[PDB]
Each structure stands twice: as C-alpha cells, then as structure tokens.
Amino acid sequence: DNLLVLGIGISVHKTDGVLRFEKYCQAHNLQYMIVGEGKKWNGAGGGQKINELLIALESIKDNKLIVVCDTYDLIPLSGPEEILRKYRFLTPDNKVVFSSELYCWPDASLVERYPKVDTKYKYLNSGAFMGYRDDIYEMIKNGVKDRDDDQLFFSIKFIETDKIVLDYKCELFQAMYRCNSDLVVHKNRIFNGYTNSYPVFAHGNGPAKKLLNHMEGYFMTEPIDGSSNTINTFKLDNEPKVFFALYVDSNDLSALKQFLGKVASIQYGNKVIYLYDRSDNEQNRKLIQISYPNYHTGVTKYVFDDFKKSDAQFYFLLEQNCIITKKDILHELIMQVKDNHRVISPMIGYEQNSTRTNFWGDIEDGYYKRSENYLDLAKHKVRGLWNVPYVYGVILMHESVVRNWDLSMVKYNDKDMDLCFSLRKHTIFMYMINNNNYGYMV
C-alpha cells in the first residue's frame, strides 16, 4: 500500500518541468523525491540518471515499491491506489514494469531481438518504470558512464533477462510521441483509444513535450474556482518590486509618446523603469529623460544586466507596439505567478485584426504554426493559462527565471524569437493568459 516516486531532475536550479511534476505529484497525494536536485547535469546519453538513482537508492533500505520517472516532460494523472492496482495486475510476479513506446531506440538493430507482439507499442522506454527497490538496485548496482545511454542499458536488460515486463497496454505509462491520434483529454485524464486505457503517467517523450504542454491547459490539479473572474479588478495587498523594461524607438516619436502614456497609466507603486531605445535621437532623449532618467540608446537586444543589479523581483518586458489598456494588469499577472507558472504573457491582438495575437500555439522549424485550439484561444472560447512555445511584447518573468538562467542564447538573430528559444531550451515554460481584455498591438 506504500509507494514512493523517484523523479529524476538533475539540475542546479529547478526547471518548470520539475516544478510542474512536483505540483501534479502533490495533487494526487504521491510521495516523491527529486533525484539529483541541486546537482549539475553532465549526461543519446543519460547515464548520469542511473548513477544518481543508485545514490538515491542507498537511502532507501527497506524493499519499497518505487516508481522511477523523468520529470521535465512528464506528469502523473492519478494517485497511489490506482498505480498499485495496475502494478499488481500487470505483474503478479512483482517484476519491474517499464513503459512501452513505438520506436526501437537508440539501437534500431534490437528490432529482431524484441518479443513479437500484436500491438504497435513494441519497445522499451526508460523514461518511466516501477518495481521493488532491491530489484532495481540489482540491475544498476555497478553504475554506468555518465555519457552511456540509459535507454539502451535497460533495453538490453529487458531482452536479455526476465527481470522486466513492458506496459504494452499503456496502463501505468504513456510515451506520447507520435501517438497523437490515440490520445484524447477526457474527465481530467488522458484516454488512449488504441489501448483502451487511461495511462497514469503522461510522458511527452522527445518532441512530444509539445503535445503534453498543449494538453496541460486542459488538465487541473484541483477543481477550478469558478468565481476567479467574477470580480475582474485586481489589487495586491503587498506589491513586490517590478522592473519595467521598455523596448522603444524614438525615431517614431508619436508611437513612443502614445506607448509611454499607456505604460504610465499601469497602476503600480513599487517599480523601477528603464527605457531601451533602438535609436539615438539626442534631442528626443533629452525631452523624455526628464520623466524617464534611466534611458539607454542603440539597444537592439533584450537587456538583463540592469535588472540583475537591481533588487526587483519581477522583470516586465514591454515592446513599443504593445498598447496596454487594462490598468490593473500587473496585479492580475503577479497573482498568477506560482509554482511552474513563472513567465506569463497577456494575450493581445492587432487593433485591425484581433485574431492575430502576441503568442503562437505551435511552432514548426522555428516559426508560427496554427495549433488545434489557436482560434478558440484567440476568440476567448476558453480562458486561462496556456503553455505555448512563443510569447511576444508583454511578458512578466519572475526573478528566479531571469537571475538563474541564460536568456540571451542566439539561434534566430531575432530578439523576441531568441528569448523564447532560450526559455524552451531550459524547460522554462511560457504561459499565455487570456482571462481579460488587456490591450492590443499596433
């Protein structure tokens, strides 16, 4: 009746993936520990995961039933009772149950060595497994190289011993990659229509991180508060310090004045404001600097150095073409910042065309792709927080993101695309929020 979940999360600072994993664990009353928390990542690869798990197993002396799983791209959707029932049904012999998956990876030549089975879910995936501590210890007691492939290691174990059984019917585990057409969200669960099951652990393995991120906006960790927007004015009892970073171009003095007027109307007591001007019109700067002394010229990238030197707890990035009309927006946004929700961007559309917005629901080779629910979100058919690959122009970011992670990585040579690229690379999530009417773009 006892169960412990060992989620692998090796990092000096916590990603949003691990934060989300933890929140889902707590919501389902799953006892867990994060293996490798606070330690540096080294690890095809992932050998360090086995090495860190071995260390963790040294503190578990009793022969406990344990789950071992990825955390960055994985969430539990049910509690210990369901997991225990399924485990006992899957393996009366108390073997180690591993996730199945569609592909034979990383060694495609193991194909002929796997047991033949009717299902397309033929192969092992090492991102989730469950068994007795002693059995798992026995398999890993000698360690591996940090750079070894944990998936290959366990695949060999599976084909060459009798210690492991695969979860072919996706009862405990779902490797979601390329299973889009099998899976639907129903009653706060994933239902797999292929296997006729409701997998407990939803693993967005490999690229399927985007499928899991997409579904996340439909799940809940507890019943929603239906009165959350009944009063849609917001005011914090205590205002944390917010650093306003304004990305402007004084070449267009008209746009600048209109934008600064809206920014000045955002209601917020505890702030510091910096202007980062693309241009260098000196007479303009002189004028504006009377009201905004923190003024820098020739800036064509996003700047975090001033923020880092400040004692601000939030960074609020605002682009000149983004017109905020909801005066209490910062109170509203800050109230949503908690757990894995650390980067939040209010949805606004073009004044001329309101379905074209400051977020992308999907991405393909780096650029905008229309997602399944994009138009629903843009027209407010459903509202809330949505995990998306790109946000633009109005972004609130908690200091734990800005102070601890490299947000200046370059792939596209485009400041807004590169910010989102950096976040994606670190498993820091961007949340679009569409709870109210916030503004528009010009």
Question: Which residues make up the interface to Mn ion (CB under 5 A)?
Answer: 70, 73, 127, 205
Minimal distance, residue 8 CB to Mn ion, in Å: 9
Tell which residue, 42, 33, 40, 45, has the closest CA to residue 8.
33
- If you compute the radius of gyration of the chain from its CA atoms, what whole number of angstroms results? 24
360 forms beta bridges with 390
Question: Which helix H or strand E contains 12, and what residues bound it?
Answer: none
Minimal distance, residue 174 CB to Mn ion, in Å: 12
Minimal distance, residue 177 CB to Mn ion, in Å: 9
- For the chain, the distance separating the N- and C-terminal CA atoms, rounded to the nearest angstrom, is 59
Residue nearest to Mn ion (CB): 70
Minimal distance, residue 188 CB to Mn ion, in Å: 22
Q: Could you tell me where the DSSP H helices lie in 91-180?
A: 133-140, 150-160
Could you give the CA distance from residue 437 to residue 351 in angstroms, rounded to a whole number?
A: 12
**CB closer to Mn ion, 204 vs 349:** 204
| Amino acid identity at 365 | D
**CB closer to Mn ion, 128 vs 433:** 128
Tell which residue, 24, 1, 165, 28, has the closest CA to residue 84.
1
Minimal distance, residue 127 CB to Mn ion, in Å: 4
Minimal distance, residue 11 CB to Mn ion, in Å: 14
| Amino acid identity at 333 | L
Could you give the CA distance from residue 337 to residue 282 in angstroms, rounded to a whole number?
A: 38
For 190, the 3-state DSSP assignment is: strand
**CB closer to Mn ion, 18 vs 323:** 18
Minimal distance, residue 209 CB to Mn ion, in Å: 8
Tell which residue, 92, 85, 73, 76, has the closest CA to residue 5.
76
**CB closer to Mn ion, 80 vs 127:** 127
Strands 173-175 and 201-203 turn out to be parallel
Minimal distance, residue 167 CB to Mn ion, in Å: 15
Could you give the CA distance from residue 90 to residue 96 in angstroms, rounded to a whole number?
A: 10
**CB closer to Mn ion, 21 vs 274:** 21
**CB closer to Mn ion, 99 vs 434:** 99
**CB closer to Mn ion, 73 vs 148:** 73
**CB closer to Mn ion, 57 vs 208:** 208
Residue 270's alpha-carbon distances to 243, 267, 273, 403, in angstroms, are 9, 10, 10, 19
Could you give the CA distance from residue 307 to residue 401 in angstroms, rounded to a whole number?
A: 12
**CB closer to Mn ion, 16 vs 73:** 73
Q: Classify burial at 121, counting beta carbons within 10 Å of its beta carbon; exposed 0-12, middle 13-18, buried 19 or more.
A: buried
Minimal distance, residue 133 CB to Mn ion, in Å: 22
Cis peptide, bond prior to residue 106, ω within 30 of zero: yes
**CB closer to Mn ion, 46 vs 389:** 46
Q: Could you tell me where the DSSP H helices lie in 237-320?
A: 253-265, 282-289, 305-309
Distant-in-sequence, close-in-space partners of 220: CB < 8 Å, separation ≥ 6: 188
Minimal distance, residue 74 CB to Mn ion, in Å: 6
DSSP E strands, 187-335: 189-192, 201-203, 242-248, 271-277, 295-296, 314-319, 322-324
**CB closer to Mn ion, 197 vs 427:** 427
Minimal distance, residue 170 CB to Mn ion, in Å: 16
